[PDB]
Design a protein around this ligand. Structure first.
Ligand SMILES: Cc1cc(O)c2c(c1)C(=O)c1cc(O)cc(O)c1C2=O
Ligand SMILES: [Cl-]
Length: 328
């Protein structure tokens, strides 16, 4: 399998661009930055609002937990390459603690509104707008030969007052190389594409489009998360129960993939369900025909069938967002 767009970005670019293991970090001054308060945390980092004591400007301080040095150079390189792109969080400095060697990545300040509280209040138009803005981030990183691999609401920071969006946490992102076999243990379970769940390792940018589709579905149907499985096997079951197993067999046959006799027994047999089966009073309107057409074009087993980020941006679902942007 290979990506249908941007397959050659790293083929044409100098090894300097994608050879992150060869990166040698230039450490800044750790004293330039003071923690103000913790604002987030995860398996790989703790995140704080900080202050740059030189200019007294706010910033974000991401303190990295112990991991392989290669993963640290990878995130740094990718952030450097993407810095300046639309709606990509900006890495401004990198520092570390002399004694412990604990590294911290310093980012432009981002003022997040918690998605669990934000999403319920989003209007129809807000959803179209924020998804369009996210799509800019994704087409951009894809055009620069990079897959995010962890698209989920937690990694989409939104300052709703200023209608600003930033795609964050590039700690799982990777460079795309045609034919390369990647680790499938990426992305949060609810947002794992079928390719990850059936061990198709030569995947690409289209992985991010499945994860986006999951986010979108959760938004318009007001179900968080949309595909709610308890482990990876169960996650594939939840997908099969909606998309149907006929399509799954076609997918697996196309890519010559064999399912575990165990996993296969679990998945069983399911008809494809219509997207409107999930419409209800809390969500009936968020679920217009254009929303369903667009969603349906993202949530496809076959990664090669999914809309690209660029295509997605042009779907008529977003026509008003485009019109409003053009008039500016
Ligand atoms: C709860 C929370 C609030 C944030 O503002 C950030 C994060 C989490 C966060 O995880 C994060 C990761 C990152 O790689 C860059 C960031 O700017 C961030 C963040 O800015
Ligand atoms: Cl930098």
């Amino acid at each position: 399998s290979k990506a249908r767009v941007y397959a050659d970005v790293n083929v044409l670019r100098p090894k300097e661009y994608w050879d992150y293991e060869a990166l040698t970090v230039q450490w800044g001054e750790q004293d330039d930055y003071e923690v103000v308060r913790k604002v987030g945390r995860g398996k790989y980092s703790e995140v704080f609002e900080g202050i740059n004591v030189n200019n007294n400007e706010k910033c974000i301080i991401k303190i990295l937990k112990p991991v392989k040095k290669k993963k640290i150079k990878r995130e740094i390189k990718i952030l450097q390459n993407l810095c300046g792109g639309p709606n990509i969080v900006k890495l401004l400095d990198i520092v570390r603690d002399q004694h412990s060697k604990t590294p911290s990545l310093i980012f432009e300040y981002v003022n997040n509104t918690d998605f669990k509280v934000l999403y319920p209040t989003l209007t129809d138009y807000d959803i179209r707008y924020y998804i369009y803005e996210l799509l800019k981030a994704l087409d951009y990183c894809h055009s620069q030969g990079i897959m995010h691999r962890d698209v989920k609401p937690h990694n989409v920071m939104i300052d709703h007052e200023l209608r600003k969006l930033r795609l964050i946490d590039w700690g799982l992102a990777e460079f795309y190389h045609p034919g390369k076999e990647y680790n499938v243990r990426v992305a949060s379970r609810y947002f794992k594409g079928p390719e990850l769940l059936v061990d198709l390792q030569d995947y690409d940018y289209s992985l991010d489009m499945w994860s986006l589709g999951c986010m979108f579905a959760g938004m318009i149907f007001r179900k968080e998360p949309f595909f709610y499985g308890h482990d990876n096997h169960d996650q594939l079951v939840k997908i099969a129960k909606v998309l149907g197993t006929d399509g799954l067999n076609v997918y697996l046959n196309k890519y010559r993939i064999e399912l575990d006799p165990q996993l296969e027994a679990l998945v069983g047999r399911h008809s494809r369900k219509p997207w409107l089966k999930f419409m209800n009073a809390d969500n009936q309107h968020l679920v217009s025909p254009e929303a369903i057409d667009f969603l349906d074009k993202l949530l496809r087993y076959d990664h090669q069938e999914r809309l690209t980020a660029l295509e997605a941006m042009t779907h008529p679902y977003f026509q008003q967002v485009r019109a409003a942007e053009n008039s500016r």
